[PDB]
Structures are given as C-alpha cells and as structure tokens.
Subunit: 169 residues, 4 copies
C-alpha cells in the first residue's frame, strides 16, 4: 500500500514536527566545522557543527569527533544574537588559512559567549568567506523580521576562547 | 534513563542519518516557495518548497497547502543539474515584483525540466535576489568539488512552463 | 587671453567630443589588464557609449595603443566572469570574458581583469559592476545580455581584427 | 602612411596624457547627473556631470545645459574625500524613487562641501543604487591604497545644498 515516496515523505513531515517547537518554522540549515582551537590533544581533527535557523531561533549542535552523535546542543533565541564577526581564522601560529564566522550571543544576561564556525571547503585554495557572508545575511534578515538590527562586521578575529558553552533546550 | 537534553540530541543525530543515504553528507537546506504559476487553481496561495543539498545530490520537496506534508519529492543527482538562471519572475502581465531562481535539470536524458523557486521574505521592498544568489553559489561549488561545473546566469526568465515533474528516489 | 582653468575645461570638452562619434554619449570607462596568455601586464582601455563599447590594447614598453576596436553593443553576445584560465596550479584572480559577433561569427572574445593593488584581492566585484553597466546599456537600446558566473575555458580567441 | 587605427591610437595616447598630470594614471570614469538643485542656474534640469578617477585624485566636471561646455571643473585629491553617503534623493515632499550619491570633500580645511550625483542609466523600475555602490567601491579601494580610509554610509539625504563650489586645478 505505502510507497517509498510516501514513506520518505512521512518521515520528513514527522521530523520537522519533532525537531522544532510548534510555533517555529524552518528557514535554513548548514553543515559547518568548529573554528575555535580546543584545549584537548595534539592530533588535529574536524568537529562537525550543525547550524539550523527558524523564524525566531538558531540552533547550534556539535558532533563527536569519532562516532556519530551530538556532544553539545543549543537552542538560542535570535534576540540574544548580538553581532556577527567575519574574518581570518584566529590561529595560534602561522598565516590564517581561511575565514571563520563568530556568532556572539547573550547568555544569562552576560556576554563573552561565542561560537566560531567555518564552512566545509573541499577545495583547499578556497577561502570560504562568501559562504559565511551568505549565512550571516540570512541570520541578519531573519532577526530584522522580528524588528531588531544585527551588525555583520568584517575584522580580524581575536584569538580567544568564549565562556564555557552550556547546553540549552 | 536519559535527560530532556539527551533525547533531543539523539533525535537530531538519528534524523540527519535517516534524511540522506549512508554515503551522503548534508551541506545545506533552505525553505522556499514555488515561483511558477501552477495550474490547479489561479489564486493567491504560496506553495512551500524544501531544498536540500548533499555532497552528491539535491532534494526538492513540494508541500500541500492544506496540510504540512509532501505532494512531490525528488532526489536529483548533481551531475544532472545543468544550469541556474536568476532573474525577475515570469509574470503573465505587468511588473515583476521579486526575483526567482530556476534550476534546469536533465531527466531520462531529456531536458526542459526546471524548478522555479523564490525566497520567503518579510520585506515587500526586497526582491530576495541575494538569498537566491547565495543558494546558487553553494550548489555551484558543491558540483565543482565533484569535478564538473555549473553556470549561474543572470538574465530575464522566460514565460514558459516546465515539463511535468515526476517523483524520483 | 585665456586662463589655465579655461584651457583645462576646453581640453576636456574637445577630448570628450573627439573620443566618440557625433551621435554617441559617454556612459563609462575603465582601465583594465589583458587576462589571456599571448602567442608583463598589457594595459587595456575599455569605454562604453549608449550604442557601442571600445577596447584598446597598449604596448608593454611604449605608451602607445597597438590594437583598437569599436564594437556595437548589439554584437556583444554574453559576458562570462570567473577564475582565470591558467596553465598552472591555482587561478590568482577573476577575469571577465566579453564574447562578440564579428562579421556574423562567434569565437571572438576579450578576457580582461581589474587593476588591483592589494594582492589579497579577487577583483570580482569590480568586474561584476562593469558587466552590469554593459548589460543595462544594451538592454535600453536593444536585446538582453546574459552574465554568466562559471569557470572560464582554456581556449584562445579567434585572432582580433581592427574595427573603426 | 598612417592608417585610421594608427591615428585613433595616437589620439587616445596623447589625450590620456593631456587630461591628467604626468604622475597620474586613469582608473575609471562615469557619466552622472546632479541631484541637488542648481545654484548657478536655479531652475530644475538634468545637469550632466563627469566623474573621473585617477590613482591619487578624482575629477568632477559640470556641463552646461544647452551648449556642451564645462561650466565648472574641479580636481580633488582623494585624501580630502572624507565620506560617501548613499540613499534616496533629497526631495521636499513624498516618495523619492531613485537613490543618489553624496561625496563630501574638505576644501581649504573646511567641510560642508558636497556633490550629490546619480546614475544616467536606469529603468524607471530601478533605484540605481547598485551603480552608485560600484562607483563608491572604486573610490574607496583607490583612496585606501593611497591613503586614509573611506566610509560608505547608507542613509537618508537631507536636501541641504553644499557651500558654493569653487574651481580647482
């Protein structure tokens, strides 16, 4: 009775209804990599990051390095997204290799909390800046529909780690 | 047992795993609206469209207006995406308001198949062209990463309908 | 007798009159560099009127023009903007390809890039802008002009011939 | 003997040497129109303006309405160009459809001197903002290699005329 299309369709419906609250509607989603240098071990390893955008919130979810699972998750209201900075990666040595985007957010009435992300670039000689500008512009345009401005600022990224990230529902 | 946070994270990883085939990775996804005049009824109601991009394919899902679920679903290999056109909407009379994005694809080795999409915008004084240029750009580099090319063309859009779309897994 | 100023204004008047035919208005002009390999930067002057565009190549060691073309906007088929068709490794910068009909034949094109001071600068925005003026100028006078973003082909244009 | 192409070649050569000082190289040039109410001849028309850019200077020339003749000529050093404002034309009433470009220059250590220009080309449909943005971006990129930075502000333009312009060599 039920066809492949009907099954994959019903799966899509159910999962838009499970991921987001009833009042929220999907706008955009991007696969990204964590750009902040972590304080763990030597071997350089890409941390997958998922950024999802609705009409009223943006979602940041971090993936475990080796296995397929989510280590850290956050639903963040758009009003608390203060500013976006886009510029050369804050490496601890060498020339910056690519661009990263830093999303600065308000948490428990405080600043110093930020996510620094870059796009998955399969071409080594590709900057990645265009992709991040596009993402920032959609975050901006969406926040503006709520009635609030969001500055997108081009500048060199400060080599600093943002206040410990806590999980948020 | 598991916390509220643990369940949400689990649902998320499971979703991203089910959404695409084993070998594919998610790159990006966007909520859009069908831009071409559809021939069931000639009225004023937006047809919602979901566009997903993997490393090897893009996915187009049309939603029923009455209910929040699919009416049509297509997985389309990136090899078959011929070109993208971006210009003013093909209005049957008078001034075109917004820009639309036309994705020309090859189906059963035949051409003349296309999706015409636009962005959902909360500012009537914004043509949405930048949002569409961004999406086209990600489709372009993704295809360039797999070895081929994808022309993005700025021109006027022609006042013709696409060949009927068929569901494809 | 005339002043320094009066002479300067008269020179400018005379120049804009001499630059183009009686029935043409100047719209825009840009200093560019040849992007294609030749069979040392070659300076290129591109000029735009209401009905035509002008391409003039400069010799590499002397201040002189050695190739000059007036091309009607109706003969400009399409514009391609994308990374330079290099013969080695990574393309440094974007180039703009102006495809034109010459005596009812295709395969003729100029590949040009912007004069860019900062080495960490693509120069794509500058070229997008030039193409946008060529587009609207042609559209007001005649047919539409496609601007295509893609990777440029590693082919060489059909030999350029001079047009008055 | 000398061919036609040879003659136009030496005409182009000598004249790009007569217009500019010996150490100045032509970057760009645009035909524009005065947005501001004329002060020399009060009545409303479309005063032709030529804007030329070299590596160290920009040139502004006002043509006479009836006969083609330079009524006002200014060579202005890029260092004295402090800001560029873009946005709707300054009217006394109602809706401004097209946008203008206001270049503020410092003259004899004093401010309040500006040129308000708009693009010649357009459809009544388009505001002409994109063109002026491109010009602004060439003036910015040129001055910056040479000197101090140049901000481009998007804002409403008062229609406040700018201190009487004096001819400069």
């Amino acid at each position: 009775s039920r066809s492949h299309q009907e099954l994959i369709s019903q799966l899509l419906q159910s999962y838009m209804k499970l991921l987001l609250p009833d009042d929220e509607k999907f706008h955009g989603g991007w696969a990204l990599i964590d750009c902040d240098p972590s304080l763990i071990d030597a071997t350089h390893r890409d941390v997958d990051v998922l950024l999802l955008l609705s009409n009223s919130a943006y979602y940041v979810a971090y993936y475990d390095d080796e296995v397929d699972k989510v280590n850290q998750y956050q639903r963040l209201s758009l009003e608390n997204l203060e500013k976006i900075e886009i510029g050369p990666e804050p490496t601890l040595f060498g020339k910056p290799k690519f661009s990263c985007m830093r999303l600065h957010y308000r948490y428990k009435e405080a600043s110093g909390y930020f996510h620094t992300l870059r796009a998955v670039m399969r071409n080594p000689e590709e900057d990645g800046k265009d992709t991040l500008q596009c993402i920032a512009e959609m975050l901006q345009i969406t926040k503006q529909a709520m009635g609030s401005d969001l500055p997108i600022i081009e500048k060199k990224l400060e080599a600093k780690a943002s206040k410990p990230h806590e999980d948020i529902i």
